[PDB]
Amino acid sequence: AAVRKIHVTVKFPSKQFTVEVDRTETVSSLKDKIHIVENTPIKRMQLYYSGIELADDYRNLNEYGITEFSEIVVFLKSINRAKD
Numbered sequence: 001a002a003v004r005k006i007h008v009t010v011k012f013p014s015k016q017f018t019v020e021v022d023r024t025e026t027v028s029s030l031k032d033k034i035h036i037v038e039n040t041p042i043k044r045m046q047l048y049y050s051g052i053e054l055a056d057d058y059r060n061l062n063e064y065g066i067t068e069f070s071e072i073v074v075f076l077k078s079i080n081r082a083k084d
Contacts, residue, residue, distance in 0.1 A: 006066060010034055011073045023062035027054055030061060034074055039084065044077040 006023045008030055010016065019033040031042045038045070047054065050071045054064055061070075 028057040046075040
């Protein structure tokens with residue numbers, strides 16, 4: 001395919017949701033999208049990718065092998081969302 005945008009499947013234990021990102025953007029941009037959807041800070045949120053866990057925020061999605069079928073499981077830590 002000749003497409004510069006990619007879709008990512010974000011799986012939570014309670015719910016699932018999909019997000020739209022660019023292949024040339026870093027996983028931190030994917031985390032930004034997750035943060036927008038969720039109420040949990042990125043510094044707390046943990047991200048696991050089918051098979052290999054990417055701990056490198058600065059790693060690009062395309063360079064890491066993230067496609068339009070990417071399956072990523074995301075874990076939420078206990079945080080404080082008072083007065084939100």
